[PDB]
């Protein structure tokens, strides 16, 4: 119960804090680590890190030494500069964006999971969301960003949304919890899962 825990940058801060409080309520030593989802699954896989619990959106069912569960959901938007070509065109489609350039997270130096795989042939990789939104806000391209990162810049006109046809409201991605196999038998972990999940649901509806 000396715990190392990972959360990705798509996890809303309210989400990570909701988790933290519970973790400390049921494990008394909790160390928190943050990474962008592209590097999330890789980090836990490197055994030199000793991550016991990881909360991310990238999935691989062949993860060794780790089991899986769903902890809740988060939302994401296809955002782009207000004067971007697509923004003008009101009919946006998965093909229509394959032509224009995508600012995307991660590195070409890695197994691009389907979830974080670039959908377009013309791409530019960045390493965090701040650099993604800097480029997108300069018309470089379009991107897929979490809610908490962009919400304000869209209610402010700084940015726009092209995802209001595909999934009106945001692209509901699942948020996964990866427990080290060993932790399955510790009543602390299971109580964490219960209390956290409830709290997350309660916050989500609001």
Ligand X SMILES: CC(C)Oc1ccc(-c2ncc(CNc3ccnc(C(F)(F)F)c3)s2)cc1Cl
Long-range interactions of 180-187: CB distance < 8 A, separation 24+: 180/52, 180/53, 180/65, 180/66, 180/67, 181/65, 181/66, 181/67, 183/52, 183/53, 184/67, 186/1
Is position 38 an interface residue for ligand X (rule: CB under 6 A)?
no
Q: What CA–CA distance (Å, rounded) separates 203 from 88?
A: 35
Is position 78 an interface residue for ligand X (rule: CB under 6 A)?
yes
By CB under 6 A, name the one of 41, 97, 135, 160 that touches ligand X: 97
| Measured distance between the N- and C-terminal CA atoms of the chain, rounded to whole angstroms | 32
Residues 6+ apart with CB under 8 A from 70: 174, 175, 176, 177
Region 108-147 residues binding ligand X, contact defined as CB under 6 A: 115-116, 119, 144-146
Binding to ligand X by CB under 6 A, coded x per residue (else -) over 53-72, reads ----x---------------
Is position 40 an interface residue for ligand X (rule: CB under 6 A)?
no
Contact 102, 119 (CB under 8 A): yes
> With contacts defined by CB under 6 A, how many residues of the chain interact with ligand X?
19
Task: Tell me whether residue 18 or residue 40 sits nearer to ligand X (CB atom).
Answer: 40
By CB under 6 A, name the one of 19, 162, 175, 196 that touches ligand X: 162
Q: Which residue has the tokens 């989802």?
A: 37
Contact 33, 5 (CB under 8 A): yes
Least CB distance to ligand X at residue 19 (A): 17
Region 178-197 residues binding ligand X, contact defined as CB under 6 A: none
Is position 11 an interface residue for ligand X (rule: CB under 6 A)?
no
CA 135 to chain centre: 19
Task: Tell me whether residue 130 or residue 194 sits nearer to ligand X (CB atom).
Answer: 130
By CB under 6 A, name the one of 7, 76, 150, 177 that touches ligand X: 76
Residues 6+ apart with CB under 8 A from 13: 148
Three-state DSSP class for residue 27: coil
By CB under 6 A, name the one of 18, 56, 163, 180 that touches ligand X: 163
Task: Tell me whether residue 44 or residue 175 sits nearer to ligand X (CB atom).
Answer: 175
Least CB distance to ligand X at residue 50 (A): 25
Contact residues for ligand X, defined by CB under 6 A:
10, 57, 76, 78, 92-94, 97, 115-116, 119, 144-146, 162-163, 166, 171, 173
């Amino acid at each position: 119960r000396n715990l190392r825990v990972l959360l990705d940058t798509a996890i809303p801060p309210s989400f990570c804090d909701t988790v933290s409080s519970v973790l400390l309520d049921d494990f008394n030593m909790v160390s928190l680590i943050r990474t962008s989802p592209a590097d999330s699954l890789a980090t836990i896989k490197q055994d030199n890190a000793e991550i016991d619990i990881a909360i991310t959106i990238d999935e691989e069912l062949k993860i060794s030494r780790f089991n899986q569960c769903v902890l809740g959901y988060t939302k994401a938007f296809v955002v782009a500069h207000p004067q971007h070509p697509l923004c003008n065109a009101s009919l946006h489609s998965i093909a229509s964006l394959a032509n224009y350039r995508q600012i995307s997270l991660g590195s070409r130096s890695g197994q691009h999971s389907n979830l974080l795989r670039p959908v377009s042939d013309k791409v530019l990789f960045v390493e965090n969301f701040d650099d993604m939104l800097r480029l997108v806000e300069a018309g470089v391209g379009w991107g897929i960003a979490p809610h908490y990162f962009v919400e304000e810049r869209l209610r402010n006109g700084t940015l726009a949304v092209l995802s209001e046809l595909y999934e009106p409201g945001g692209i509901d991605t699942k948020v996964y919890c990866y427990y080290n196999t060993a932790l399955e038998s510790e009543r602390s972990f299971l109580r964490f899962l219960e209390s956290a999940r409830q709290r997350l649901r309660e916050l989500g509806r609001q």
